Design a protein around this motif. Structure first.
Motif, PDB file in Angstrom:
ATOM      1  N   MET A 135      24.616  42.417  -3.630  1.00 27.03           N
ATOM      2  CA  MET A 135      24.309  43.732  -3.052  1.00 27.03           C
ATOM      3  C   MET A 135      24.003  44.775  -4.119  1.00 27.03           C
ATOM      4  O   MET A 135      23.033  45.528  -4.006  1.00 27.03           O
ATOM      5  CB  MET A 135      25.476  44.234  -2.196  1.00 27.03           C
ATOM      6  N   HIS A 137      44.508  49.363  -4.623  1.00 24.23           N
ATOM      7  CA  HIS A 137      43.647  50.194  -5.475  1.00 24.23           C
ATOM      8  C   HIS A 137      44.056  51.672  -5.550  1.00 24.23           C
ATOM      9  O   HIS A 137      43.324  52.481  -6.127  1.00 24.23           O
ATOM     10  CB  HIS A 137      42.198  50.083  -4.994  1.00 24.23           C
ATOM     11  N   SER A 189      38.396  56.873  -7.340  1.00 19.08           N
ATOM     12  CA  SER A 189      38.455  56.391  -5.961  1.00 19.08           C
ATOM     13  C   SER A 189      39.630  55.438  -5.768  1.00 19.08           C
ATOM     14  O   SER A 189      39.937  54.634  -6.652  1.00 19.08           O
ATOM     15  CB  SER A 189      37.150  55.689  -5.574  1.00 19.08           C
ATOM     16  N   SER A 198      39.878  52.887  -3.776  1.00 14.01           N
ATOM     17  CA  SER A 198      39.167  51.935  -2.929  1.00 14.01           C
ATOM     18  C   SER A 198      38.584  50.784  -3.735  1.00 14.01           C
ATOM     19  O   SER A 198      38.285  50.933  -4.923  1.00 14.01           O
ATOM     20  CB  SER A 198      38.031  52.650  -2.199  1.00 14.01           C
ATOM     21  N   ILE A 199      38.423  49.641  -3.074  1.00  9.88           N
ATOM     22  CA  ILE A 199      37.660  48.525  -3.626  1.00  9.88           C
ATOM     23  C   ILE A 199      36.171  48.830  -3.450  1.00  9.88           C
ATOM     24  O   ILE A 199      35.783  49.534  -2.511  1.00  9.88           O
ATOM     25  CB  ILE A 199      38.051  47.176  -2.966  1.00  9.88           C
ATOM     26  N   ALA A 200      35.352  48.294  -4.350  1.00  8.37           N
ATOM     27  CA  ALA A 200      33.917  48.578  -4.385  1.00  8.37           C
ATOM     28  C   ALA A 200      33.092  47.403  -3.845  1.00  8.37           C
ATOM     29  O   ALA A 200      32.098  46.997  -4.452  1.00  8.37           O
ATOM     30  CB  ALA A 200      33.510  48.920  -5.808  1.00  8.37           C
ATOM     31  N   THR A 201      33.495  46.889  -2.682  1.00  7.83           N
ATOM     32  CA  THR A 201      32.921  45.665  -2.113  1.00  7.83           C
ATOM     33  C   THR A 201      31.652  45.954  -1.307  1.00  7.83           C
ATOM     34  O   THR A 201      30.602  45.365  -1.560  1.00  7.83           O
ATOM     35  CB  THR A 201      33.948  44.936  -1.220  1.00  7.83           C
ATOM     36  N   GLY A 202      31.769  46.845  -0.326  1.00  9.03           N
ATOM     37  CA  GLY A 202      30.638  47.227   0.525  1.00  9.03           C
ATOM     38  C   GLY A 202      29.740  48.319  -0.039  1.00  9.03           C
ATOM     39  O   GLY A 202      28.661  48.571   0.504  1.00  9.03           O
ATOM     40  N   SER A 203      30.173  48.961  -1.125  1.00  7.58           N
ATOM     41  CA  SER A 203      29.491  50.143  -1.658  1.00  7.58           C
ATOM     42  C   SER A 203      28.193  49.819  -2.406  1.00  7.58           C
ATOM     43  O   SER A 203      28.173  48.982  -3.312  1.00  7.58           O
ATOM     44  CB  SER A 203      30.432  50.939  -2.572  1.00  7.58           C
ATOM     45  N   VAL A 204      27.120  50.496  -1.997  1.00 17.01           N
ATOM     46  CA  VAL A 204      25.846  50.543  -2.724  1.00 17.01           C
ATOM     47  C   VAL A 204      25.820  51.777  -3.656  1.00 17.01           C
ATOM     48  O   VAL A 204      24.873  51.958  -4.425  1.00 17.01           O
ATOM     49  CB  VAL A 204      24.661  50.547  -1.719  1.00 17.01           C
ATOM     50  N   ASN A 205      26.878  52.596  -3.600  1.00 20.83           N
ATOM     51  CA  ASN A 205      27.022  53.805  -4.428  1.00 20.83           C
ATOM     52  C   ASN A 205      26.686  53.572  -5.905  1.00 20.83           C
ATOM     53  O   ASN A 205      26.986  52.513  -6.463  1.00 20.83           O
ATOM     54  CB  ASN A 205      28.454  54.363  -4.302  1.00 20.83           C
ATOM     55  N   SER A 206      26.077  54.578  -6.526  1.00 21.73           N
ATOM     56  CA  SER A 206      25.606  54.490  -7.911  1.00 21.73           C
ATOM     57  C   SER A 206      26.749  54.493  -8.929  1.00 21.73           C
ATOM     58  O   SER A 206      26.596  53.980 -10.040  1.00 21.73           O
ATOM     59  CB  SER A 206      24.652  55.644  -8.213  1.00 21.73           C
ATOM     60  N   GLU A 207      27.887  55.068  -8.540  1.00 17.93           N
ATOM     61  CA  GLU A 207      29.105  55.055  -9.357  1.00 17.93           C
ATOM     62  C   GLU A 207      29.865  53.722  -9.285  1.00 17.93           C
ATOM     63  O   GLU A 207      30.824  53.510 -10.031  1.00 17.93           O
ATOM     64  CB  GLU A 207      30.023  56.198  -8.926  1.00 17.93           C
ATOM     65  N   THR A 208      29.426  52.840  -8.386  1.00 17.48           N
ATOM     66  CA  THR A 208      30.031  51.532  -8.138  1.00 17.48           C
ATOM     67  C   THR A 208      29.244  50.385  -8.815  1.00 17.48           C
ATOM     68  O   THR A 208      29.852  49.419  -9.282  1.00 17.48           O
ATOM     69  CB  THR A 208      30.197  51.333  -6.602  1.00 17.48           C
ATOM     70  N   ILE A 209      27.913  50.491  -8.852  1.00 20.49           N
ATOM     71  CA  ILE A 209      27.038  49.474  -9.469  1.00 20.49           C
ATOM     72  C   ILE A 209      27.358  49.290 -10.965  1.00 20.49           C
ATOM     73  O   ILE A 209      27.561  50.279 -11.669  1.00 20.49           O
ATOM     74  CB  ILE A 209      25.537  49.837  -9.258  1.00 20.49           C
ATOM     75  N   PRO A 210      27.419  48.025 -11.447  1.00 24.37           N
ATOM     76  CA  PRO A 210      27.667  47.787 -12.878  1.00 24.37           C
ATOM     77  C   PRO A 210      26.466  48.111 -13.770  1.00 24.37           C
ATOM     78  O   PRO A 210      25.333  48.179 -13.291  1.00 24.37           O
ATOM     79  CB  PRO A 210      28.001  46.291 -12.935  1.00 24.37           C
ATOM     80  N   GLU A 221      33.379  42.941  -6.920  1.00 23.01           N
ATOM     81  CA  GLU A 221      34.778  42.947  -6.506  1.00 23.01           C
ATOM     82  C   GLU A 221      34.839  42.409  -5.082  1.00 23.01           C
ATOM     83  O   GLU A 221      34.042  42.817  -4.232  1.00 23.01           O
ATOM     84  CB  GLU A 221      35.348  44.367  -6.546  1.00 23.01           C
ATOM     85  N   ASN A 276      33.703  59.578  -7.353  1.00 21.75           N
ATOM     86  CA  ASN A 276      34.771  59.754  -8.348  1.00 21.75           C
ATOM     87  C   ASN A 276      34.952  61.152  -8.947  1.00 21.75           C
ATOM     88  O   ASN A 276      35.924  61.383  -9.661  1.00 21.75           O
ATOM     89  CB  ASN A 276      34.567  58.757  -9.478  1.00 21.75           C
ATOM     90  N   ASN A 323      23.945  59.058  -5.923  1.00 19.20           N
ATOM     91  CA  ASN A 323      23.144  58.870  -4.702  1.00 19.20           C
ATOM     92  C   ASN A 323      23.859  59.357  -3.436  1.00 19.20           C
ATOM     93  O   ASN A 323      23.238  59.985  -2.575  1.00 19.20           O
ATOM     94  CB  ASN A 323      22.664  57.409  -4.543  1.00 19.20           C
ATOM     95  N   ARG A 328      33.359  58.555  -0.875  1.00 19.15           N
ATOM     96  CA  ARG A 328      34.518  57.888  -1.458  1.00 19.15           C
ATOM     97  C   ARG A 328      34.746  56.684  -0.552  1.00 19.15           C
ATOM     98  O   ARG A 328      34.298  56.696   0.584  1.00 19.15           O
ATOM     99  CB  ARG A 328      35.749  58.797  -1.445  1.00 19.15           C
ATOM    100  N   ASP A 373      29.063  40.992  -2.961  1.00 18.40           N
ATOM    101  CA  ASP A 373      29.109  42.344  -3.523  1.00 18.40           C
ATOM    102  C   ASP A 373      28.200  42.475  -4.746  1.00 18.40           C
ATOM    103  O   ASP A 373      27.432  43.434  -4.856  1.00 18.40           O
ATOM    104  CB  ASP A 373      30.550  42.696  -3.909  1.00 18.40           C
ATOM    105  N   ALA A 424      28.325  41.535   4.049  1.00 21.01           N
ATOM    106  CA  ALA A 424      28.425  42.727   3.193  1.00 21.01           C
ATOM    107  C   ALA A 424      27.718  43.943   3.795  1.00 21.01           C
ATOM    108  O   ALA A 424      28.332  44.744   4.499  1.00 21.01           O
ATOM    109  CB  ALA A 424      27.911  42.442   1.785  1.00 21.01           C
ATOM    110  N   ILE A 466      37.047  53.598   1.581  1.00 25.01           N
ATOM    111  CA  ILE A 466      38.230  53.602   2.429  1.00 25.01           C
ATOM    112  C   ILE A 466      39.403  53.271   1.523  1.00 25.01           C
ATOM    113  O   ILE A 466      39.286  52.438   0.622  1.00 25.01           O
ATOM    114  CB  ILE A 466      38.150  52.563   3.567  1.00 25.01           C
TER     115      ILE A 466
END
Ligand SMILES: [Mg+2]
Ligand SMILES: [Mg+2]
Ligand SMILES: [Mg+2]
Ligand SMILES: [Mg+2]
Ligand SMILES: [Mg+2]
Ligand SMILES: [Mg+2]
Ligand SMILES: [Mg+2]
Ligand SMILES: [Mg+2]
Ligand SMILES: [Mg+2]
Ligand SMILES: [Mg+2]
Ligand SMILES: [Mg+2]
Ligand SMILES: [Mg+2]
Ligand SMILES: [Mg+2]
Ligand SMILES: [Mg+2]
Ligand SMILES: [Mg+2]
Lengths: 118, 138, 52, 177, 324, 168
Positions: E302, B132, D40, D42-54, E283, A58, A10, B125, E299, D177, B127
RNA sequence: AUAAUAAUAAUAUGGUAAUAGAACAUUUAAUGAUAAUAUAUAUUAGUUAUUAAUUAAUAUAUGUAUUAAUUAAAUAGAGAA
RNA sequence: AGUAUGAAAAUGAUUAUUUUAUAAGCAAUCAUGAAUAUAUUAUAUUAUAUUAAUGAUGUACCUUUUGUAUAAUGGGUCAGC
């Protein structure tokens, strides 16, 4: 080149180069080129060609310049303009003559309208 | 339980439909006044018509006043540039008019080195984070 | 002496050269004329009241 | 592993340990043309990214389920439990009948100072939260408690009140968030 | 002759033009033409229609004109025709906006909570936003008086081109507003105008190109940035997450320390992950352990809600909001 | 006696001026501005009665004049409608009153100085504890409410320019 | 066969003493519309590659520029005695 | 040493905003957080303005000299000349 993860994602960024100057962008981003564009008028669309890197969170495709067939990256020329006018003074240390070096460089505001894997 | 935070959208002019920044230009001149000669000549000499034909989204007002000759543009953001074209020839006036039409209405501003792109978007990507990172520090 | 018709491209136009003084005079005449009209009507109403 | 792309760090030409902030070195670093896997940093806390969603939150007909990007780097066996309730560690129990509940309610109304939530919990082998859910105290007791709290708040200095406000603001910010 | 009579006949002519919006007069109006060119409106959409869209309802002059002493004077506009205003158009435009925007939002975020969705919709097409858009386009308000216009001796074309409602002269002079209804507000009038334009576009294109209106909306309204992640505000998110896990075929969520540094300091860092089984859902970083736990739950929520599927996927209809 | 609502739009300066105040002014006081300052700094934000009391028991010569001025300002405030126990000195300053007459001091061994003889005026603005002070307390409260908290692991801006490249 | 403006390719553009070329501010004289919706001066924020002028707001004056422009001239520009 | 007018500056006091009690040098420039103010298109994740967090660079000006941060000349500041 299996470009499937990029296509799926996305969020997606590009690192296109105008005159070897890289600009890292997403869609909606508002690039400010530090020169006067002669070729394009305001309202004209620019199809970016020398795209170095196309990246997801990624993964990243990289080419020099990535195959034009694989992607799209349309900028719109949204106003030629200038920087703020400045006048630094040039002078030597026991000399009353003080030459004013006036400066007001040109800018071209682009807006990245489209960026997607074709 | 979940609750909304009232928030408003941000218009990006370019991405969907480009609305042209320059909306109106006012040519101002004087019948007396030798500083308004080049402006008067420009108004007379078929250039203004051509201009209007080229740019039918801009409206071209033509006004008469006692003072110096003026080129005031009017942009989508609400700002107004006003260029005094005193003692300029026809061609200089035309160049000034071209400059005005080119402008996005925004105020002039000093930019630092490489202050190129202006994003509303969160980073694709993330921050960086030291916990991490790929290579751990020592 | 330019006009809106002179340019033949409909986004171009020339605003009307009416002198400020002339406009002021016109305003004076109109508001004066209204006042005259009103005053006469009030007088008439007074006369009618006096009658009955 | 669906994809067998080569993986890369975000590479500088310079010493990364000494010049991580130097953009110039990153700009210089060219790498051969093709597809890469840059995990990445980075932590995936704020991300709505599709590579981040479980994958469980992806839909069944989503192509992204099969692709290997929501990486399970951590392991739940290795990580220890944080602020976990006693029900979660040793399972939920639904043992108390209606009569027991009614007795608890009677007790709580009668004397909440003597028969407090914790005491009830100890008696019936159940949570204080559950006791609360079951039974209201006498409203007088609640009023008294509110008055005590107000008195405590009044007893504060200016600084403490400000700190409490700041803490509250931080708490509110956590859930954004 | 008399100047009053001359003014009166001019006023009458202006009123007649407003009633009609004659096509030739509308065409002559430069401002309308420039607006038409700017937005790239269809050629089937006539200039009279555009003028009408800018004409708000104004049948009768209100009672508040009687006293400028009470802080209001309505002397700019002229009475309009009952069956030639932007009112019906406006409603249609509003309906279109409410349908299409909402649909687009649902397509983007099929699980988005109801309240959050409503807020997003509002953001996309709120009255203030619509007014701003209209201003950006160049829909200028008829602020000048009728008498003043007559004195200047300007054509009716210019009047037609401007936005026309009961705009209160001396609205905020000496820093005094009167707090009138929605029928005298500028923002509202501008919103109506932008909705009316949309409705006019729909009317002209529907039979030839049914989706022309919706692509125009997409270009202008749906092109605007809105980060949906900034819309949310949770309360007790861990409980909500647990409920969600129960509803689906998922194991009970538990939070666990992944990484930790600076415990016994002013500003520690605790990374905790909410696992359901071996899979991590959310996370969460934090200064305290509690904070980190909360953040992991938020998270996860969200990721649940703001899940955006691909266009290639078959439609995702969510199973409602997680009723805790 | 009306159904018309209103909303008032004032500036900061307009707000400041319209709050009830009273403007005391001295006559041509015989003193230095520096000497006046040396006292007047003590009477900064005092209640007028307190300030008057301080002036009464001050050892300085300008003090009596300052006390008299304060008394006059109180009287003016009373005449207007205000109360003396409500009034505090918001501002109190001094200035040169002009026309200082220079006069040569003759020194030993054909040297000279010039002796000026300074005259000053003290003005002061008395404002009300009932309004102005309340207003600024309210403003302070609003500012406190607005104030974003100290977050420990908080979002600070990644200062510096990006450079057309990801560093992570 | 010119002038103005804009392209392309090339070369040049540090500067004391000095030489040469081109402008602007100020004041007076000749010519000279216009007007309180105007002009002048000041402050603040915009605009024009900007010692200058212009736009807007605000303030004070004035029933009004020896005004724009071209010429003629100068008690014509000051951190340096 | 005319008469009116006078937000011309130097200069003094006071108030407001902002920074400042572990930091060292022409007191500026550039980078760059934060705080405040204004903003009838801040739609904002907005724009301008003000302000010695922090970082970097930075040896007043003139004269006269082969050569001056010079501890060589000259100037207390501003206004008029
Ligand atoms: Mg020098
Ligand atoms: Mg030398
Ligand atoms: Mg190094
Ligand atoms: Mg005096
Ligand atoms: Mg002696
Ligand atoms: Mg002395
Ligand atoms: Mg040279
Ligand atoms: Mg001289
Ligand atoms: Mg001087
Ligand atoms: Mg000088
Ligand atoms: Mg300290
Ligand atoms: Mg020191
Ligand atoms: Mg020394
Ligand atoms: Mg010296
Ligand atoms: Mg000396």
């Amino acid at each position: 080149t299996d470009t499937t993860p990029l296509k799926l994602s996305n969020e997606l960024y590009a690192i296109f180069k105008i005159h070897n100057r890289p600009y890292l962008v997403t869609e909606g981003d508002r690039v400010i080129l530090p020169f006067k564009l002669k070729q394009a008028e305001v309202g004209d669309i620019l199809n970016m060609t020398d795209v170095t890197t196309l990246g997801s969170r990624n993964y990243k495709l990289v080419g020099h310049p990535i195959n034009t067939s694989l992607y799209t990256l349309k900028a719109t020329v949204v106003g030629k303009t200038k920087r703020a006018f400045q006048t630094r003074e040039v002078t030597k240390r026991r000399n009353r003559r003080v030459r004013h070096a006036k400066s007001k460089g040109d800018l071209t505001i682009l807006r990245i309208s489209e960026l997607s894997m074709n | 339980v979940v609750k909304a935070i009232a928030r408003n959208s941000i218009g990006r002019n370019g991405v969907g439909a480009f609305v042209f920044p320059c909306r109106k230009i006012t040519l101002q001149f004087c019948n007396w006044g030798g500083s308004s000669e080049g402006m008067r000549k420009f108004l007379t000499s078929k250039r203004l018509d051509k201009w209007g034909q080229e740019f039918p989204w801009i409206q071209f007002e033509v006004m008469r006043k006692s003072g110096h000759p003026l080129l005031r543009a009017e942009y989508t953001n609400g700002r107004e540039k006003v260029i005094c074209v005193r003692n300029l020839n026809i061609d200089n006036v035309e160049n000034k008019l071209k400059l005005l039409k080119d402008s996005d209405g925004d105020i002039l501003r000093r930019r630092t080195k490489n202050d190129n792109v202006e994003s509303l978007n969160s980073s694709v990507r993330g921050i960086w984070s030291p916990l991490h990172a790929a290579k751990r520090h020592r | 002496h330019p006009f809106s018709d002179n340019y033949a491209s409909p986004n171009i136009y020339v605003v009307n050269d009416v002198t400020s003084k002339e406009q002021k005079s016109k305003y004076d005449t109109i508001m004066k004329e209204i006042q005259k009209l009103e005053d006469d009507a009030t007088r008439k109403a007074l006369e009618t009241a006096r009658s009955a | 592993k669906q994809f067998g792309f080569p993986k890369t760090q975000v590479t500088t030409i310079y010493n990364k340990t000494k010049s991580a902030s130097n953009y110039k070195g990153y700009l210089k670093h060219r790498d051969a043309p093709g597809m890469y896997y840059q995990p990445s940093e980075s932590i995936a806390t704020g991300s709505v990214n599709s590579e981040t969603i479980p994958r469980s939150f992806m839909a069944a007909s989503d192509p992204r389920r099969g692709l290997d990007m929501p990486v399970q780097s951590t392991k739940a066996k290795q990580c220890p439990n944080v602020l976990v309730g006693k029900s979660t560690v040793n399972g939920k129990t639904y043992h108390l009948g209606p009569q027991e509940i009614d007795e608890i309610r009677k007790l709580r109304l009668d004397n909440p100072q003597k028969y407090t939530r914790k005491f009830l919990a100890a008696k019936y082998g159940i949570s204080p939260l559950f006791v609360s859910m079951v039974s209201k105290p006498s409203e007088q007791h609640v009023q008294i408690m509110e008055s005590r709290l107000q008195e405590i708040q009044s007893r504060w200095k200016e600084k403490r009140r400000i700190a409490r406000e700041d803490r509250k603001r931080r708490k509110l910010l956590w859930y954004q968030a | 002759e008399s100047e009053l009579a001359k003014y009166k006949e001019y006023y009458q002519g202006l009123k007649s033009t407003v009633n009609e919006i004659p096509e030739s007069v509308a065409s002559k109006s430069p401002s309308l033409r420039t607006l038409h060119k700017r937005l790239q409106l269809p050629n089937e959409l006539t200039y009279s229609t555009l003028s009408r869209c800018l004409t708000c309802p104004s049948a009768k002059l209100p009672d508040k004109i009687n006293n400028p002493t009470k802080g209001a004077a309505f002397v700019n506009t002229v009475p309009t025709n009952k069956y030639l205003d932007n009112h019906g158009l406006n409603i249609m435009g509003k309906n279109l906006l409410s349908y299409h925007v909402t649909k687009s939002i649902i397509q983007k975020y099929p699980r988005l909570p109801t309240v959050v969705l409503n807020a997003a919709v509002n953001a996309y097409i709120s009255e203030a936003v619509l007014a701003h858009i209209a201003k950006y386009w160049g829909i200028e308000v008829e602020t000048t008086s009728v008498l003043s216009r007559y004195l200047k001796m300007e054509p009716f074309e210019f009047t037609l081109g401007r936005l026309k409602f009961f705009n209160n002269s001396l609205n905020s002079k000496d820093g005094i507003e009167l707090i009138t209804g929605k029928n005298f507000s500028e923002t509202s009038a501008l919103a109506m105008s932008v909705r009316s334009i949309i409705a006019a576009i729909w009317a002209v294109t529907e039979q030839k190109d049914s989706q022309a209106v919706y692509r125009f909306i997409d270009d202008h309204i749906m092109s605007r940035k809105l980060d949906i992640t900034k819309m949310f505000q949770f309360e007790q998110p861990t409980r909500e997450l647990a409920m969600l896990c129960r509803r689906e075929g998922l194991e009970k969520p538990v939070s666990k320390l992944v990484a930790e540094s600076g415990r016994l300091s002013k500003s520690p860092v605790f990374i905790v992950h909410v696992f359901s089984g071996e899979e991590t859902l959310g996370e969460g970083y934090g200064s305290s352990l509690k904070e980190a736990k909360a953040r992991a739950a938020t998270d996860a929520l969200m990721k649940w809600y703001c899940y955006e599927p691909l266009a290639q996927q078959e439609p995702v209809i969510d199973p409602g909001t997680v009723v805790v | 006696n009306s159904s018309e609502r209103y909303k008032l739009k004032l500036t900061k300066r307009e707000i400041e001026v319209l709050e009830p105040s009273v403007y005391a002014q001295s006559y041509r006081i015989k003193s230095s501005m520096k000497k006046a300052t040396l006292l007047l700094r003590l009477l900064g934000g005092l209640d007028v009665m307190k300030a008057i009391s301080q002036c009464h028991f001050s050892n300085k010569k300008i003090a009596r004049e300052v006390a008299e001025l304060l008394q006059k300002g109180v009287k003016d405030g009373q005449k207007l409608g205000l109360k003396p126990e409500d009034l505090y000195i918001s501002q109190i300053w001094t200035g040169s009153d002009g026309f200082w007459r220079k006069r040569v001091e003759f020194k030993a061994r054909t040297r000279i100085g010039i002796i000026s003889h300074p005259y000053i005026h003290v003005r002061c603005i008395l404002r009300t504890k009932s309004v102005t002070k309340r207003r600024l307390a309210y403003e302070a409260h609003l500012k406190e409410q607005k104030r974003a908290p100290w977050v420990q692991l908080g979002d600070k801006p990644i200062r510096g320019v990006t450079g057309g490249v990801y560093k992570w």
